[PDB]
Design a protein around this ligand. Structure first.
Ligand SMILES: [Zn+2]
Ligand SMILES: [Zn+2]
Ligand SMILES: [Zn+2]
Ligand SMILES: [Zn+2]
Lengths: 351, 351, 351, 351
């Protein structure tokens, strides 16, 4: 089979690989729709995942089951499925401790284009079909469903880790796809005021559509000062770090109130470390909790988010700015995420 | 001054009383708009909290500060305020334990028409003004603001105790004002499917307006069976008990899944046993947690809920089906809550 | 093979059943030491979970692995292991929801002598060995290790569900083995005052040994009245329901403070008699949370508990008052639990 | 009156200063026993205090009430009391938000020698006596009681913030007084293995007395490596940072397992900021939660910890290595905390 892989650091291209085979509990799936992610860019041009050879990229996809192992019981060839980017090995001690995302290792739950060929191929492998797949609703637009696989679950997890209270004020730093879902998730957790930080026009409009009551640009001064002016020197209850460099941590700590919570859902791929401003962090005693984690995956997570979409709790269509038709457009779409044109949020390739 | 009070069990009437005076940290407020509650009915006609003599009723109001003690710093005569129904004594060990609703005693945080003269008077007393009042926004309709003082805070608390997860299925038993806010709150906590139980046309319409995806009527069969039918025998993740008799506890336990949560915000009492069905409760080992608590109050809660309204997180105008004017309408409006006509949700009397 | 089973309600006796067969991921284990439980009694003589036929009893055992399936990697023949009484199917949505105890059904995580042949046989079956077994320390007495399988995990779970705070006062209703572990558990969570309820001398000295600061005997007045006198009418922060009839729920509600938590780990007999007292429960608004659940199981739990014992965090030897040898004595031991002598806590049968 | 104050950065000495007077809700207390703290050192020599002039030092004390305001009801002249180092203003929004430690400002709950004259004076002031004092048991040694004021509440808070589970492995970095209580607290939260990091012989013995199952010294290799060796490459569930510099944060992140929790109770008074290692932190998605907070204060906290001591849950005497008699020894005891002789843990001055 043919697949769009990473020939090597800073190098991409199509390669020829043998079709993956399913174990007794797995499934081989063919993509119906896929979407490039900021991670595919990190992994290649930033070596976020060290070096890799002939590895098929991509981890956001909806598709059709074409083959299932003999022990698979809830899925059969022909089924249309939503594939969460995170597909944990459910039989590990990390799962027993309540952290499937790190089953068998840190971030190990995230297999596609991590240490397992991704979805940008004619076919791809899904471990434990019954535990990691969800049926795609009959009338659901492919472009929308693809947003569930990573954008929705990650953004929403940002709001969950933030332990938002009804009426809490929230600042979302970064208004790209993930940050936009962080805003929507924050609203669906009862957030009162929601301040989105970003400037890309199409993103600013989407941020407001999802719930942002205020928008701040870095170009108008220090974000912390801006936030303080909007909150009359009180600061905000919660901060969700969805984009930017390591400097956003320092900003989150400075604008968040003592006893507040900072939730990171941004994948930091550059630099040796992130810095916590001592004074603003109350010298480590201001109860400004710092959290951060990979989006939950698996069947239950996918079905629950899917149902939120079916019940119109969120309109995912506003995330899709570009739609291509044809496997041949994968390279074009991915390169779109690399150059980051100003009118882009997410791109979906419909085979 | 005059005040509409509970002369005794099953006895109402206007009485003459001495105008309360403000202590160093208190405020005397004159009502601008009030609303009768089912709690007033339970307390009077059912004596759900013991006997009372000459106690002015009502605990839902918006008003004008007419006097403050010498130590009050954030409120002054002339300010328009939202008065939360729960006004705790913030200097108590229960507060240090994290339960303001019970400062100095069970339910003692809720004073108005409990053990303190209520708001159905020319003037009423508010303890610790700086900690228990919130400013009324200039453009906010008085009827809507009154819904914050109890309905919104209680309904949302029901959704808070329920510890709802993104996509959780929820059943709200009782779709009166409290249940309606329970529904709205459930949606604002990320609920996917929301099943409302009730039949009054006006309430059914409001339930769907707030987020109900399904409506069930007792006349179509046992509620538990219906819920099992809608869910293909799987039950629901959460249940919020907002209205109905004590038997709804049994229904909640029977329809909720193991590991699920039942949240009570229904002021029980009456004269019917609160029974937990043993088999359905897993003999006490099915992790079906049961919670239930008086709504949070105080300035912070009022300001946070108020801000949600300002940011259009919820439209409270749908709760008000009747608006009257003048003190000489408090009685009629209260009797309306007793007769419970099919066309009533909440009534507000604007003075 | 031979096995002591429940022929049917009120009927017990040795029978010749089929020998369990190990699937690719299971293990066949031969018991080295077992212990009868009150649960066996409820199940047989009370049909608390439903009638059964020729079901081998017992769910508390330590044993030797004699056979493992072809896919088992961490255990092999010859290994001595601690078998937790709760062995969940780890590949289920309940597990994905965070409740292994109810994998594939309410209480379905607890298989042995629930709907699967128990440990009172020449050999027994353990589903998914790699996920449900733990190595037995070389120097750990068999009698002590058997206490980890259910008594320790259940008692500690009551303490966990109780959400005890540093200094919290706690009442443990019932000082049988489960309550004793509830007491030890409470101390190990930071409890200050710990009031144990019971009268058997042997249990009384064990309770104090585990941390009880006060012991209440029924013959000195009703338990609620005693606790209220000991606490000057203030009640206690937490209540763990370990033993007794269904009236203990009401007693727990009556002595727990507003905002308190009731933790049930008592497998309840029959009826529904789980009545909640309206007034003491603040009409459902006193924030008196009621929790209750089946003990956690699986490999991780058994290893974590095992390590607590190895590090002397709790001395399990005080739970064993009777030790017998040989399969023959399984019947004698079990009947001992039915008669509930005053000198018994737990009995262990070493094969 | 006389008081041992800070005459200026890196300057100490006795001074004459006005004796405080009690507000209507305050009390004036005369010290019975006091103890110098590492904070007194940072404040005077590290200037993390933002510098001050003629400020009386000390915040750890037990004493006698000699005067109360007209509105004080639960404490009267002659009462012996435990004074928590943290004495918040209980009437504030931060308290309503659940964070007394920061009422009216970040760390504002800590008043003594922060922005209010400390306890090293003939008399000192306590705001809101009824909410901020606890009665000192008649038979409790003054030296032990003083350890409750900060060491115990802080160390225990580290264990509380760590949200420890029964059997969790815990590493405590720093075995000075605070870390010693972090170890005791961890044990009292059900920790299995507890690894203490320190080298001072007197502290190492104390560490083992309170529950340390292992002791690691920096002089034997990278602490993370040493921990991995003990844990066979799996790391630990929890880490409590109780001593050392900002490098402990990096070590904490590296040794804790994904999904683990890092609890900081160490006052960081040097450096521009603390650094989080990007890779070890899973690029911000390893669910390695970071917490850090000032110890709780107030009457409830003090009574609850006090009762734990009364019920022998922890023996505080092992923290007191030096005992002096006489006000004139405060300077000597304080300098002891500066020079840090090897046989020191905590010094108490009994007036
Ligand atoms: Zn992605
Ligand atoms: Zn009301
Ligand atoms: Zn048992
Ligand atoms: Zn100190």
């Amino acid at each position: 089979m043919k697949g769009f892989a990473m020939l090597g650091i800073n190098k991409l291209g199509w390669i020829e690989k043998e079709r993956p085979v399913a174990g007794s509990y797995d499934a081989i799936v063919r993509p119906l729709a896929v979407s490039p992610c900021t991670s595919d860019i990190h992994t290649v041009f930033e070596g976020a995942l060290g070096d890799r050879k002939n590895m098929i990229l991509g981890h956001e996809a909806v598709g059709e089951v074409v083959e299932v192992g003999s022990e698979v019981k809830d899925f059969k060839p022909g089924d249309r499925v939503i594939v969460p980017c995170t597909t944990p090995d459910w039989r590990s001690l990390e799962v027993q401790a309540g952290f499937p995302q790190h089953s068998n290792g840190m971030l190990a739950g995230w297999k596609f284009s991590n240490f397992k060929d991704g979805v940008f191929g004619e076919y791809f492998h899904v471990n434990d079909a019954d535990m990691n797949l969800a049926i795609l609703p009959k009338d659901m637009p492919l472009e929308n469903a693809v947003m569930i696989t990573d954008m929705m679950t990650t953004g929403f997890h940002g709001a969950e880790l933030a332990d938002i209270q009804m009426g809490s004020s929230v600042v979302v730093i970064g208004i790209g796809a993930v940050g936009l879902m962080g805003i929507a998730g924050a609203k669906l957790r009862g957030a009162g005021r929601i301040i989105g930080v970003g400037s890309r026009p199409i993103c600013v409009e989407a941020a407001k559509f999802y719930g942002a009551t205020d928008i701040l640009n870095y170009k108008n001064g220090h974000i912390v000062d801006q936030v303080m002016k909007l909150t009359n020197g009180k600061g905000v209850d919660r901060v969700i770090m969805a984009g930017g460099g390591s400097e956003t941590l320092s900003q989150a700590v400075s604008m968040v109130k003592p006893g507040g919570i900072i939730s990171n859902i941004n994948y930091h791929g550059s630099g040796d470390a992130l810095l916590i401003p001592r004074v603003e962090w109350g010298c480590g005693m201001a109860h400004k909790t710092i959290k951060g984690g990979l989006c939950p995956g698996g069947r239950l997570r996918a079905e629950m988010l899917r149902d939120m979409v079916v019940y119109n709790r969120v309109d995912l269509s506003k995330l899709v700015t570009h739609v291509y038709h044809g496997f041949d457009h994968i390279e074009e779409a991915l390169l779109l995420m690399k150059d980051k044109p100003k009118d882009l949020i997410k791109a979906v390739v419909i085979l």
